[PDB]
Design an enzyme around this catalytic site. Structure first.
Site, PDB file in Angstrom:
ATOM      1  N   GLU A 247       0.917  -1.278   0.026  1.00  0.00           N
ATOM      2  CA  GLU A 247      -0.056  -0.134   0.140  1.00  0.00           C
ATOM      3  C   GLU A 247       0.730   1.644   0.095  1.00  0.00           C
ATOM      4  O   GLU A 247       0.559   2.206   0.244  1.00  0.00           O
ATOM      5  CB  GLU A 247      -1.067  -0.176   1.354  1.00  0.00           C
ATOM      6  CG  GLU A 247      -2.100  -0.732   0.748  1.00  0.00           C
ATOM      7  CD  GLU A 247      -1.579  -2.842   1.397  1.00  0.00           C
ATOM      8  OE1 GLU A 247      -1.727  -3.181   0.958  1.00  0.00           O
ATOM      9  OE2 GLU A 247      -0.360  -2.301   2.162  1.00  0.00           O
TER      10      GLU A 247
ATOM     11  N   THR B 210       0.566   2.573  -8.289  1.00  0.00           N
ATOM     12  CA  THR B 210      -0.002   4.325  -8.671  1.00  0.00           C
ATOM     13  C   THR B 210       0.856   4.779  -9.792  1.00  0.00           C
ATOM     14  O   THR B 210       0.372   5.338 -10.278  1.00  0.00           O
ATOM     15  CB  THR B 210      -0.045   4.539  -7.123  1.00  0.00           C
ATOM     16  OG1 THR B 210      -0.695   3.448  -6.441  1.00  0.00           O
ATOM     17  CG2 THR B 210      -1.428   6.234  -7.299  1.00  0.00           C
TER      18      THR B 210
ATOM     19  N   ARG C 102      -6.498  -8.915 -15.643  1.00  0.00           N
ATOM     20  CA  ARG C 102      -6.165 -10.767 -15.678  1.00  0.00           C
ATOM     21  C   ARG C 102      -6.053 -10.469 -14.008  1.00  0.00           C
ATOM     22  O   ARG C 102      -4.860 -10.082 -13.395  1.00  0.00           O
ATOM     23  CB  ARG C 102      -4.855 -11.121 -16.075  1.00  0.00           C
ATOM     24  CG  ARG C 102      -4.284 -12.673 -15.847  1.00  0.00           C
ATOM     25  CD  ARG C 102      -3.183 -12.852 -16.298  1.00  0.00           C
ATOM     26  NE  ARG C 102      -3.474 -13.990 -15.866  1.00  0.00           N
ATOM     27  CZ  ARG C 102      -2.123 -15.257 -16.725  1.00  0.00           C
ATOM     28  NH1 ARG C 102      -1.346 -14.614 -17.477  1.00  0.00           N
ATOM     29  NH2 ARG C 102      -2.291 -16.581 -16.269  1.00  0.00           N
TER      30      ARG C 102
ATOM     31  N   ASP D 111       7.393  -2.873 -11.696  1.00  0.00           N
ATOM     32  CA  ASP D 111       6.423  -3.297  -9.867  1.00  0.00           C
ATOM     33  C   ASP D 111       5.889  -3.393  -9.687  1.00  0.00           C
ATOM     34  O   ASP D 111       5.794  -5.009 -10.334  1.00  0.00           O
ATOM     35  CB  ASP D 111       5.444  -2.225 -10.381  1.00  0.00           C
ATOM     36  CG  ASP D 111       4.996  -1.700  -8.797  1.00  0.00           C
ATOM     37  OD1 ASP D 111       5.860  -1.732  -8.217  1.00  0.00           O
ATOM     38  OD2 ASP D 111       3.579  -1.363  -9.469  1.00  0.00           O
TER      39      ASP D 111
ATOM     40  N   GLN E  47       3.402  -5.940   0.154  1.00  0.00           N
ATOM     41  CA  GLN E  47       3.655  -6.999   0.654  1.00  0.00           C
ATOM     42  C   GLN E  47       4.099  -8.102   1.388  1.00  0.00           C
ATOM     43  O   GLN E  47       5.232  -8.399   0.456  1.00  0.00           O
ATOM     44  CB  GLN E  47       1.902  -8.015   0.348  1.00  0.00           C
ATOM     45  CG  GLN E  47       2.112  -8.407  -0.068  1.00  0.00           C
ATOM     46  CD  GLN E  47       0.998  -9.204  -1.116  1.00  0.00           C
ATOM     47  OE1 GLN E  47      -0.180  -9.820   0.472  1.00  0.00           O
ATOM     48  NE2 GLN E  47       0.417  -9.100  -1.992  1.00  0.00           N
TER      49      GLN E  47
END
EC number: 3.6.5.-
Length: 323
Positions: free
Chosen positions: A12, A17, A147, A169, A173
Site C-alpha cells: 500500500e 499508482t 487478468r 513494479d 506486502q
C-alpha cells in the site's frame, strides 16, 4: 539510453499508482497494436469487478442508495458481453458509472476487506470515461491492470527525453517481497515509495506493527545493498496529499515517539524524510534523491519524474572507481 527503473516499498505504498500515471504522461512506446490486444481484457475486468462488488452487496445485505440502480444492475449483465468482446457502448459505460457512484455500492467497496474485489476495480471504474472512449487504445498501466491471476512483475515501457525506460513494479506486502530479487538484475535506478500517511497505520500482516516502521526496514536494506551501490537511489515520499490533511487530525508521535514537533505537514513530513535519509550508512559516498509525490496527481508525478530523469542522465552513464 535505456534506464530500467524499479519500484520498491512496503504494501500500500502506491508503487503501482505511479505506473498508472506514466502511461498517460508518456507516449510513443512503440506499443499501439499490442495494447489493442489487451483492450478486450481491460473491459472484461471492469465488468467482473463491478459485479464483484454487487456480489458482495447481497452477501452483506447492502442495498443500492437509489432503487433505480437495481435496474442498472440487471442491464449490466446483458450489455457486459459486449465489453468482453472488446466493445464498450455508451449504454454499457453509463450503467457502470451510475452503479460505481451509488452510495450502496460505495458502502461495499469501502468494506472491500470483507470480500475479494478486483485490484483494478478502482482503476478502470474511476477512469471509466477514458477507457470507454471510441477507438480506445490501452496504455502501459492499463494492460498491467488486467487478468485477475497474478501476471508476475508489472512491466512498463515508455520513452522520455529520448530514453527508453523499462519501469517495473512488484507487490509490497511481505509475501511478494521475495520476487524483488528477480528485478534486481539490470536496474539503472530505484524509486522507493513510502506512504507518508501510513505513519499511524499498521501492517495488514501484523496489526501490532507500524506500516511506516516496516518501510524503514526495507529502505535500509536497499540503500545499503552492495548490489545497489552503483545503482542510483531515489526516495519517493508518496501520498503527500493524504499526509497534509491527515497530520492535522492525528499526531506523528504514533510512529516516532521521540518526535516533539507540531502536527503540521511541513514539520512532520520533513521529520520522516530525515529518518529515512539517515538510514544511508554511507552519507559520504552515497547520495539520496528525495521528492514528495502524489501518485494519483498526474501533474505532480510528471514534474517530480522529470527531475529524477535528469539525475539518471548525469549520474548513470559511466562506471566510477573513486567515490
Amino acid at each position: 539510453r535505456e534506464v530500467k527503473l524499479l519500484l520498491l516499498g512496503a504494501g500500500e505504498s502506491g508503487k503501482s499508482t505511479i505506473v498508472k500515471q506514466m502511461k498517460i504522461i508518456h507516449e510513443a512506446g512503440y506499443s499501439e497494436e499490442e495494447c489493442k490486444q489487451y483492450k478486450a481484457v481491460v473491459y472484461s475486468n471492469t465488468i467482473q469487478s463491478i459485479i464483484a462488488i454487487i456480489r458482495a452487496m447481497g452477501r452483506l445485505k447492502i442495498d443500492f442508495g437509489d432503487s433505480a440502480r437495481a435496474d442498472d444492475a440487471r442491464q449490466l449483465f446483458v450489455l457486459a458481453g459486449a465489453a468482453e468482446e472488446g466493445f464498450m457502448t455508451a449504454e454499457l459505460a453509463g450503467v457502470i458509472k451510475r452503479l460505481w457512484k451509488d452510495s450502496g455500492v460505495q458502502a461495499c467497496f469501502n468494506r472491500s476487506r470483507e470480500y475479494q474485489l478486483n485490484d483494478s476495480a478502482a482503476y478502470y471504474l474511476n477512469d471509466l470515461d477514458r477507457i470507454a472512449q471510441p477507438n480506445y487504445i490501452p496504455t502501459q498501466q492499463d494492460v498491467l491492470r488486467t487478468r485477475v491471476k497474478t501476471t508476475g512483475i508489472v512491466e512498463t515501457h515508455f520513452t522520455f527525453k529520448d530514453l527508453h525506460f523499462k519501469m517495473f513494479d512488484v507487490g509490497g506486502q511481505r509475501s511478494e517481497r521475495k520476487k524483488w530479487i528477480h528485478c534486481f538484475e539490470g536496474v539503472a535506478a530505484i524509486i522507493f515509495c513510502v506512504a507518508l500517511s501510513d505513519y499511524d497505520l499498521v501492517l495488514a500482516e501484523d496489526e501490532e506493527m507500524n506500516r511506516m516502521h516496516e518501510s524503514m526496514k526495507l529502505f535500509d536494506s536497499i540503500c545499503n545493498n552492495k548490489w545497489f551501490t552503483d545503482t542510483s537511489i531515489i526516495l519517493f515520499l508518496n501520498k503527500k496529499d493524504l499526509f497534509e490533511e491527515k497530520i492535522k487530525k492525528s499526531p506523528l508521535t504514533i510512529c516516532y515517539q521521540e518526535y516533539a514537533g507540531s502536527n503540521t505537514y511541513e514539520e512532520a513530513a520533513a521529520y520522516i524524510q530525515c529518518q529515512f535519509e539517515d538510514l544511508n550508512k554511507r552519507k559520504d559516498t552515497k547520495e539520496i534523491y528525495t521528492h514528495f509525490t502524489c501518485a494519483t496527481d498526474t501533474k505532480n508525478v510528471q514534474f517530480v519524474f522529470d527531475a529524477v530523469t535528469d539525475v539518471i542522465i548525469k549520474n548513470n552513464l559511466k562506471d566510477c572507481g573513486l567515490f
